[PDB]
Amino acid sequence: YEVHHQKLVFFAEDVGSNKGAIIGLM
């Protein structure tokens, strides 16, 4: 998994599994 950053990751590393989501959607 490459992550890519600053777009949508709620399940892994663009914050650590919580992009205003608790693993789901923004």
Which residues are annotated as part of the binding site? 1, 4-5
Residue entry with tokens 């949508």: 8
Which residues are annotated as part of the binding site for Cu(2+)? 1, 4-5
Q: Could you give the angle at the alpha carbon of 15 between the alpha carbons of 3 and 6, nearest 5°? A: 55
DSSP state letter for 15:
T
φ/ψ of 4, rounded to 5, equals 70, -35
* Experimentally determined by: NMR
DSSP state letter for 16:
T
Among 21, 22, 20, 19, CA closest to 5: 19
Which residues are annotated as part of the binding site for Zn(2+)? 1, 4-5
Distance (Å) of CA 21 to CA 18, 25? 5, 5
Q: Are 14 and 23 in contact (CB under 8 A)?
A: no
